[PDB]
Amino acid sequence: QGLVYCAEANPVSFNPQVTTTGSTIDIIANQLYDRLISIDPVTAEFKSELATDWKISKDGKSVTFTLRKGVKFHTTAYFTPTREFNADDVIFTFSRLFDVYNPYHFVGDANYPYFQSVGIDQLIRKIVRVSDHQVRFELFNAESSFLANMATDFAVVLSKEYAMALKANNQENLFDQYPVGTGPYIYKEYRRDHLVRFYKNADYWKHEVALEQLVYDITPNGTTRIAKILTKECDVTAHPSSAQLSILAQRDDINVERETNLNIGYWAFNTERPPFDNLKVRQALVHAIDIEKIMQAVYYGNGLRARSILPPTSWAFEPQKNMPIFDPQLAKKLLTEAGYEKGFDMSIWAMPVSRIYNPNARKMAELMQSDLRKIGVNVNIVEYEWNTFIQRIGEHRHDSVLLGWAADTPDPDNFFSPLLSCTATFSGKNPANWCNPEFDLLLTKALDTTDLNLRKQYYDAAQSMIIEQLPLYPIAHGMRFQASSADVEGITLGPFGAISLANARKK
């Protein structure tokens, strides 16, 4: 039998390297590929995947991975391996990111957003081929977040043989669209905006794959995904719409999982755009927002009010004594003295699809529209297709935007470096358009040591600065929901990272 997964958006690629969008990763990462290592969701220990062992040198500048033997790349319609996975694949996959000499470095858009955001460039010097199944990464500096970053869904292992084959034909452009991985499922078919079809990898190293067929039904409209699970057109529904959770909860033949998760939903300001470059203005706007009405109207009481950018389950979490309080008269008192008495107009960009950190950006933007009108700020709401939306936010076309982050790892740097750093900004991934080298220095020092007490000192200072400067305003942390037919089991959500159907089965 097969499984049909109702997906909230079209995948932007079949290579996880080129995106930080969860919608795409949820489709491709755990299904077609494996990483070197992963992070246990419960102990947070690193777990062997395609790497069997890993070692960090005394100085933190050399990391040796021992690699699994006997791992086969996919046989697909367009590729058949002549050898198994080895060190050459690791060196190719990862040198593609930092080595301008890698023939694939500039393929596609030449963007590797997660990696550029956390500064691969100033990190990886080379990867030595110590043997057929062992490599050693040489870093320019120690970074205590390094393995965490190597365990993200973006850090999958690719096929060098496939890549070198396509190159021979000058068909490099095909590499990222027609994927070859080592994962539990293999690429079969893709109808743009309509569907993706995968089939079971009979030669999968890790386990005997249960499902024969996996189809993703690309259905951006939230209520339609609900409708499709009800009619059993879909077996699993991504990001179920809050308004319909109660409907699903009553159905005997449907399960809805509800898990805690490291995420943040925020209101980001384009800090390079007047009047939003003015801290007093940013402060004025935040005080106008009825956060407690959002906690109910939007989050349906399922969310946790934000006390810092970090969710309270982050080990570095520290509640900020200076979080703004909802006070509309104070907001007015601040705009004038900014000194926007007649106030001004602004846009709030709102996500078109439900995310863990924000199940209804539209509803949230409408609530804020009402709130701000009252101090005299005239909000217009902007919304586009999810992937288009991300792109135009990366081009900083907005005044402000409702966005957030679903953590890829339980390493706190993951809430900072990929979001608010200068490198993040230069990669078009910082919704606040905020380059603050002073802030970044805190991040670097936190990465200069593995001592957790020291890291948290810097992370403490970082959380405080974000509240002081308000490049963005932490709003809430959501619960991670997923609906599925009671016929399904083995599906993994987790407190971080992308969805996995690696162990899914029916009946």
Pair 416, 305 in one domain: yes
Q: ω before 339 within 30° of 0 (cis)? A: yes
Listed residues 180, 202, 232: the one ending a domain: 180
Is 357 marked as binding a ligand? Answer: yes
E-strand spans in 167-326? Answer: 185-191, 195-200, 213-218, 236-238, 254-259, 263-269, 304-305
In 40-146, beta strands by DSSP E: 46-48, 51-56, 62-67, 124-131, 134-139
* 253 lies in the same domain as 286: no
The verdict on 157 and 254 lying in the same domain is no
Tell whether 117 and 221 lie within a shared domain: no
The token duo for 163 is 């890549």
The answer on 486 and 362 residing in a single domain is no
Q: For residue 404, which amino acid is it?
A: G
Which experimental approach was used here?
Answer: X-ray
Torsional class of 264: left (φ above 0), alpha (ψ -120 to 50), beta (otherwise): beta
CATH of the domain at 414: 3.10.105.10
Instruction: Please report how many Cα atoms fall inside a 13 Å half-sphere around the Cα of residue 62, on the Cβ side.
Output: 10
Q: Which of 150, 149, 180, 183 is nearest to 34 (CA)?
A: 183
Encoded tokens for 294? 């959002």
Kind and range of the H or E run holding 97:
helix 87-98
Residue 348 backbone phi and psi in degrees, to 5:
-120, 115
- The CATH number of the domain where 252 resides is what? 3.40.190.10
Q: Is 429 annotated as a binding residue?
A: yes
What CATH number should be reported for the domain holding residue 114? Answer: 3.90.76.10
Q: How far is CA 107 from CA 6, 172, 175, 308, in A?
A: 30, 7, 9, 39
Residue 274 makes CB contacts below 8 A (sequence gap 6+) with none
380/423 same-domain check? yes
Q: Are residues 18 and 96 in the same domain?
A: yes
DSSP-derived pairing of the beta strands 2-7 and 236-238: parallel
Q: Which residue has tokens 């932007």? A: 12
DSSP state of 317: -
Distance CA 492, CA 234 (A): 17
Q: Where are the alpha helices (DSSP H) in 287-435?
A: 291-297, 328-335, 361-373, 386-394, 422-426
Q: Exposed, middle or buried by CB within 10 Å (0-12, 13-18, 19+), for 285?
A: buried
In the listed set 153, 180, 207, which residue is the last one of a domain according to the structure? 180
Determine the Cα–Cα distance for residues 288 and 374; give it in Å rounded to an integer. Answer: 8
Pair 115, 231 in one domain: no
Q: Any known ligand binding at 392?
A: no
> What are the percentages of helix, strand and coil residues in the chain, rounded to 5?
30, 25, 50
Shared domain for 74 and 19, answered yes or no, is yes
b/e burial code for range 350-384 (CB count within 10 A of at least 16 → b): bbbbbbbbbbbbbbbbbbbbebbeebbbebebbbb
- Residues 99, 233 within the same domain: no
Residue 109 CB burial class (10 angstroms; 0-12, 13-18, ≥19): exposed
- Whether 259 contacts 495, CB under 8 Å: yes
Q: How many C-beta atoms lie closer than 10 Å to residue 312's C-beta?
A: 15
- Do residues 41 and 108 share a domain? yes
Q: By three-state DSSP, how is residue 74 classified?
A: coil
Quote the domain boundaries for residue 358. Answer: 260-478
Resolution (A): 1.7
Q: What is the per-residue DSSP string for 448-492?
A: S---HHHHHHHHHHHHHHHHHH-SEEEEEE--EEEEEETTEE--B
DSSP, res 500: B
CB atoms within 10 A of CB 45: 9
297-310 b/e (C-beta count within 10 Å ≥ 16 → b)? bbbbebbeebbbbb
Pairing state between β 505-506 and 304-305 = unpaired
Phi then psi for residue 56, to 5 deg, are -105, 130
191 is known to lie in a ligand binding site: no
Into how many domains does the chain fold? 3
Distance CA 273, CA 395 (A): 13
CA nearest to 68, candidates 85, 89, 45: 85
Tell me the three-class secondary structure of 231-257, residue by residue. Answer: CCCCCEEECCCHHHHHHHHHCCCEEEE
Is-contact 235 490, C-beta < 8 A? no
Pair (87, 216) in one structural domain: no
